[PDB]
Design a protein around this ligand. Structure first.
Ligand code: CLA
Ligand code: CLA
Ligand code: CLA
Ligand code: CLA
Ligand code: CLA
Ligand code: CLA
Ligand SMILES: CCCCCCCCCCCCCCCCCC(=O)OC[C@H](CO[C@@H]1O[C@H](CO)[C@H](O)[C@H](O)[C@H]1O)OC(=O)CCCCCCCCCCCCCCCCC
Ligand code: KC2
Ligand code: KC2
Ligand SMILES: CC1=C(C#C/C(C)=C/C=C/C(C)=C/C=C/C=C(C)/C=C/C=C(\C)C#CC2=C(C)C[C@@H](O)CC2(C)C)C(C)(C)C[C@H](O)C1
Ligand SMILES: CC1=C(C#C/C(C)=C/C=C/C(C)=C/C=C/C=C(C)/C=C/C=C(\C)C#CC2=C(C)C[C@@H](O)CC2(C)C)C(C)(C)C[C@H](O)C1
Lengths: 160, 96, 189, 45, 180, 65, 35
């Protein structure tokens, strides 16, 4: 079920997920988790270093998960769910169109504002980078959160 | 505050009711004109077709030329008054 | 779609909706969940225009109602007026005449379904705008009407919802702009 | 007071039993020729 | 030769790959003594009834209609609070859906007499059952959701009867059984 | 002879008339069990007769309480 | 008193339903002159 064509194929599917689920879905998923995790890791690190202007007073010092429990009350989180959900409904259409025969390759939403992938070759190198950074990010995010659970400390603070 | 045929609320309800009645003619006709019925319109699932528990034929209907419904209820009753638990311990000429 | 592919103009990722063609005015190709596939586009167009034409009047009204009230009527925040007029029975008068016009409209929808009339044309052009001399303008106007309508429906929606949270009238909110009540003051924790 | 039902639980027998027996009758009714007959009574049974 | 689900036992004879959701699990062999079409219609109907029901237990707790007595968070408790007549009106409306959907052929012998592959009461408003391959895989999903929901509703009902708490609330503020 | 559902259900129970095991079969086992039963009957009889006094076995009305 | 009432209601409803649906089962056809 695992073949060379997908980018990033080192051939590692010990549990054989590929055999039961369409690779196009698995890939769209790996990128989507990765793209989210990269942003999450960046945010958790950014949050410790800087906060937006009025934020500290309303939320105080809560960080990581604790901030979420406080954030939901602000409704900052809701706006995030409603807008992100609106993007996702288009994303559901995209997976459906792709699963139905369609041109779009998994993970392609057509966002290249700076025309960075215009060279065909450079795109391939970037694609490998994106899965790899994303695979790392997910591992890191999980770690930062678990570290948080146990130490009650933000990751930059744990380094401090 | 009038009530019934002259009440404001019954009238708002009446317009909502008229929409419900006109919905079936207006939208069933719209659905009849082009509803689904597209080669390009088909459902999709991530799961592979070889995955276990996927039927060879859709909406399968077995003939079941077998014991009548009542006998099956008896088989289900024989579950509780004649299970095969003690046959396993069965022991292994005619006087004239 | 950074990888090359045939695709819809408004949204790069999705394919042009089937049975959605440039011919209806204001077609940027956005029907991400096909509704057009499930129900006929012309019946749907009649709806976009009807909602819009209703909405365009409503955006003007909510704003006008704030600034001015006809003298015989009292000045109250518009959402309140519906309650006042509904007790008054003014709203029933709007409902009755609007329903009568709508019954003529419902017959025209049936014709739209069976060929006959183009969606949304009631042939109401009393003025000469888009008259045979101005017939060239009709295609352009059509685009404006859908665009104004799409926008108005979003705008009214906005005025009413913003008004409920702010409890502040739309003209007032513009000139005095404040956060939703309590946010600057409140601390979640 | 209606049907002497002072306790809601009384409605369960009153509705479930007529329905269940109707279900038995539904099978008799479906196994019949329900086309019209033009006569005093239907001899098809 | 062998069931897939239960390797030790033999494949129930009646079960072949054709019905969907068939991994061979009919150990007690009900399949041999009843019509699979009757049995499937029941596997589906109990699930469809408990896909609506399980969603119902969760939704009722979070949101309740404005009308009086529709205010009890616990589903089991709510059955008593709501007006009895309304519950019968629901019974009857559902009862009509039964007769109209099955066309009045409502019994083991006649329901499937005309066509009606089990569970095809005709509700496919957005045609999604046009691809066959798609239909074969959606059908596994319905059964797998129907089977989970059955187990879930039983668990929620019994756990509420002990805790007098709705499913989400009990998980919050969980207390061991002795406390209740 | 009338055939009935209960008759067909119970027919194998009344099917092997005259079927016998060869020779003596389980006769020594029956004799041993009868000997044990005789010993048990003697024990209980001598207990009731008060010719056999086991400890904590007061054959008397006063043993009721 | 409630249990006796519910038993009586069950029995009466059962017998009345049997009567009603039995006379609905084309009773006129159950005559010796029917073909
Ligand atoms: C969720 C993230 C995710 C997803 C969807 C995938 C998906 C894929 N990977 Mg990638 N990968 C990931 C994370 C992920 N990977 C990470 C973190 C690493 C670094 C360790 C890698 C390293 C890697 C290599 C080196 C290779 C792949 C390959 C593949 C492909 C085939 C592998 C397969 O069949 O298993 C699919 C993978 C999964 C199903 C993930 C299982 C994770 C756990 C075990 C699941 C446990 C159950 C879960 C917790 C239940 C909760 C789910 C709930 C939240 C919904 C497939 C497109 C191969 C490829 O490119 O083939 C073309 C390949 O050579 N992956
Ligand atoms: C998984 C992603 C993720 C999630 C769930 C959150 C969630 C949260 N953040 Mg964090 N944040 C993130 C990424 C994320 N952030 C990133 C990537 C940055 C770097 C810019 C930050 C920087 C940041 C700061 C400085 C602060 C938060 C705060 C918050 C909280 C309130 C939301 C808010 O106002 O943030 C606003 C966040 C942004 C405006 C960043 C959005 C950047 C997006 C991802 C760019 C996407 C690329 C785009 C297409 C190119 C343009 C909430 C707990 C606030 C808080 O309560 O902390 C005390 C706060 O003060 N975040
Ligand atoms: C043309 C026919 C017609 C007639 C006879 C009426 C009659 C009435 N309407 Mg009106 N109405 C109509 C059409 C009509 N409506 C239409 C098409 C709409 C828009 C959908 C409305 C919207 C409307 C609202 C919003 C309200 C009424 C109200 C009323 C009632 C109060 C009358 C009033 O204010 O005092 C007498 C009227 C005046 C003092 C105003 C001056 C009228 C001048 C003198 C007459 C001019 C000619 C007249 C308009 C007739 C036109 C047709 C003619 C040329 C053939 C009254 C029963 C009110 C109500 O329900 O009562 C509380 C109210 O609030 N109506
Ligand atoms: C009312 C519920 C119900 C019904 C009518 C069916 C009916 C069917 N199932 Mg499904 N099934 C169900 C619930 C049900 N199932 C649940 C809850 C699960 C999850 C455990 C499954 C998992 C399952 C699998 C994996 C498979 C089936 C299959 C089948 C078919 C043949 C087996 C059979 O006749 O079982 C008849 C079953 C009953 C009459 C219900 C049992 C009633 C007992 C007496 C009480 C239940 C309690 C039980 C003992 C546990 C509590 C302790 C048939 C269409 C097979 C198939 O698709 O073949 C076509 C197949 O491979 N079923
Ligand atoms: C097995 C299914 C089932 C059953 C028996 C009940 C039973 C009950 N519900 Mg629940 N409910 C269900 C499913 C179910 N519900 C689902 C799926 C939802 C999500 C929308 C809800 C949401 C819901 C709310 C919000 C409330 C109830 C309430 C109630 C009680 C009063 C009846 C009422 O007002 O219903 C109202 C229920 C609805 C309007 C939803 C019905 C939607 C149906 C089941 C789905 C049909 C969709 C289908 C595709 C259409 C096919 C067209 C042909 C009663 C105990 C009330 C109560 O007392 O709660 C404390 C109440 O306030 N229900
Ligand atoms: C006027 C009301 C009405 C009518 C006429 C019908 C008509 C019908 N329904 Mg019903 N139904 C209704 C309302 C109605 N429905 C409502 C409101 C619900 C709840 C939402 C249901 C739920 C329902 C289900 C779940 C099923 C039906 C089925 C049927 C069909 C067969 C009826 C039959 O033979 O059952 C006569 C009655 C019985 C046979 C008694 C029920 C059997 C008991 C409850 C089984 C108990 C199993 C036991 C607990 C497990 C053992 C445990 C172990 C430890 C021993 C028929 C078309 C069945 C069907 O289509 O089958 C293919 C089916 O499976 N219906
Ligand atoms: C066909 C029948 C034609 C009958 C013609 C004569 C009718 C006379 C008037 C009858 C009124 C009926 C009103 C509804 C029924 C009712 O309320 O019951 C009235 C009583 C009410 O019962 C009492 O009500 C009280 C109210 O305060 C209390 O609740 C008591 O607890 C309760 O016992 O129920 C009965 O008496 C049932 C009697 C037995 C009926 C047997 C029917 C046999 C089959 C008839 C043919 C079927 C086809
Ligand atoms: C989806 C199933 C369903 C259908 C198809 C359906 C159709 C109709 C029709 C036919 C078109 C009418 C005319 C009608 C009228 C009323 N319904 Mg309604 N109804 C349904 C479901 C429920 C529930 C669950 C409740 C309910 C109620 C009422 C009351 C209030 C009585 C009162 O004022 O106290 C009135 C007048 C409540 C109730 O009866 O409470 C005592 C309540 O809980 N209904 N209903
Ligand atoms: C776009 C960049 C930006 C972001 C993403 C962002 C996010 C949040 C969040 C999100 C979780 C909360 C909860 C929050 C809260 C407050 N912000 Mg802030 N905010 C941003 C920018 C500015 C500016 C430019 C100002 C400002 C202010 C306040 C006040 C005022 C009252 C107070 O101080 O009590 C409060 C309560 C004003 C001010 O007075 O700051 C001292 C002001 O000028 N913010 N802000
Ligand atoms: C498309 C297009 C064109 C165009 C266009 C344009 C200009 C479109 C503009 C669209 C816009 C601006 C849409 C705005 C959506 C805002 C939303 C949904 C906010 C929701 C708030 C929520 C959910 C909340 C909340 C809550 C929070 C946060 C916490 C709570 O304590 C409080 C509260 C309840 C308030 C046009 C017509 C020109 C032409 C063309 O033919 C095509
Ligand atoms: C197209 C497309 C998509 C989409 C989409 C969207 C975004 C659809 C959004 C549609 C909307 C928001 C329609 C809104 C209509 C609002 C109206 C008609 C207002 C009426 C006001 C009235 C009658 C009033 C009033 C009042 C007045 C004036 C003043 C007061 O004193 C009184 C009163 C209160 C009575 C998606 C991707 C989802 C799917 C798809 O594949 C294709």
């Amino acid at each position: 079920g695992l073949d060379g064509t997908y980018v990033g194929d080192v051939g590692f599917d010990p549990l054989g997920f590929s055999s039961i689920i369409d690779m196009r879905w698995l890939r769209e998923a790996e990128l989507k988790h990765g793209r989210v995790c990269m942003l999450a890791a960046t945010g958790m690190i950014v949050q410790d270093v800087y906060q937006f202007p009025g934020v500290t007073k309303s939320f105080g010092d809560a960080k990581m998960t604790t901030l979420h429990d406080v954030a939901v009350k602000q409704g900052s989180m809701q706006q995030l769910l409603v807008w992100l959900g609106l993007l996702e409904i288009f994303g559901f259409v995209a997976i459906v169109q792709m699963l139905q025969g369609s041109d779009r390759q998994p993970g392609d939403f057509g966002f290249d504002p700076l025309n960075c992938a215009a060279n065909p070759d450079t795109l391939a190198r970037r694609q490998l980078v994106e899965l790899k950074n994303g695979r790392l990010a997910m591992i890191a995010t999980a770690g930062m959160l678990h570290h948080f659970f146990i130490t009650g400390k933000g990751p930059i603070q744990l380094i401090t | 505050e009038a009530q019934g045929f002259t009440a404001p609320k019954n009238h708002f309800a009446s317009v909502i009711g008229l929409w419900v009645l006109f919905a079936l003619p207006v939208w069933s006709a719209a659905y009849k004109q082009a509803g689904a019925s597209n080669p390009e319109w088909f459902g999709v699932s991530q799961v592979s077709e070889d995955a276990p528990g996927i039927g060879l034929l859709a909406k399968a209907a077995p003939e079941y030329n077998g014991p009548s419904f009542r006998e099956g209820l008896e088989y289900v009753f024989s579950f509780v008054w004649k299970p095969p638990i003690l046959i396993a311990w069965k022991p292994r000429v005619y006087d004239e | 779609a950074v990888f090359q592919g045939d695709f819809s103009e408004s949204v790069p990722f999705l394919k042009t909706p089937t049975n959605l063609d440039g011919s209806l005015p204001g077609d940027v190709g956005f029907d991400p969940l096909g509704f057009s596939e499930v129900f006929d586009i012309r019946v749907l167009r009649e709806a976009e225009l009807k909602h819009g034409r209703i909405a365009m009047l409503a955006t003007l009204g909510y704003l006008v109602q704030e600034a001015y009230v006809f003298p015989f009527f009292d000045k109250v925040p518009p959402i309140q007026a519906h309650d006042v007029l509904v007790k008054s029975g003014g709203m029933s008068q709007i409902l009755l005449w609007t329903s009568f016009l709508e019954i003529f409209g419902g017959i025209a929808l049936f014709q739209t379904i069976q060929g006959r009339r183009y969606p949304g044309d009631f042939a109401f052009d009393p003025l000469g705008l888009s008259q045979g001399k101005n017939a060239e303008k009709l295609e352009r106007y059509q685009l404006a009407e859908i665009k104004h309508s799409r926008l108005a429906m979003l705008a009214f929606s906005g005025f009413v919802h913003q008004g409920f949270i702010t409890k502040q009238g739309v003209l007032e909110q513009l000139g005095n702009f404040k956060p939703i009540p309590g946010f600057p003051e409140a601390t979640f924790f | 007071e209606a049907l002497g039902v002072d306790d809601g639980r009384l409605l369960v027998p009153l509705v479930l039993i007529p329905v269940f027996v109707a279900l038995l009758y539904g099978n008799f009714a479906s196994t019949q020729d329900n086309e019209d007959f033009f006569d005093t009574y239907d001899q098809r049974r | 030769d062998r069931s897939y689900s239960m390797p030790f036992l033999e494949r129930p004879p009646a079960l072949d790959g054709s019905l969907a959701g068939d991994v061979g699990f009919d150990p007690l062999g009900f399949s041999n003594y009843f019509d699979l079409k009757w049995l499937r219609e029941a596997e589906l109907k109990h699930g469809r009834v408990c896909m609506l029901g399980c969603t119902g237990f969760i939704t009722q707790e979070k949101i309740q209609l404005p009308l009086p007595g529709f205010d009890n968070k616990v589903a089991t408790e709510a059955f008593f609070s709501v007006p009895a007549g309304g519950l019968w009106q629901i019974f009857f409306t559902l009862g009509a859906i039964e007769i109209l959907s099955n066309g009045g052929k409502l019994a083991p012998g006649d329901m499937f007499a005309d066509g009606r592959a089990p569970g095809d009461l005709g509700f496919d408003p957005l045609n999604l059952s046009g691809d066959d391959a798609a239909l074969r895989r959606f059908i596994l999903a319905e059964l797998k959701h129907c089977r989970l929901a059955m187990i879930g509703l039983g668990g929620m009902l019994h756990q509420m009867l002990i805790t007098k708490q709705g499913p989400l609330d009990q998980l919050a503020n969980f207390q061991p059984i002795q406390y209740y | 002879a009338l055939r009935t559902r209960l008759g067909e259900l119970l027919r194998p129970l009344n099917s092997e008339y005259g079927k016998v095991a060869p020779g003596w079969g389980t006769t020594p086992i029956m004799g041993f069990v009868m000997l044990l039963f005789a010993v048990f009957l003697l024990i209980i009889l001598q207990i009731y007769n008060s010719s056999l006094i086991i400890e904590n076995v007061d054959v008397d009305w006063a043993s009721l309480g | 008193m409630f249990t006796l009432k519910i038993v009586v209601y069950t029995t009466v409803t059962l017998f009345v339903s049997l009567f009603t649906f039995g006379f609905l089962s084309n009773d006129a056809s159950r005559n010796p002159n029917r073909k």
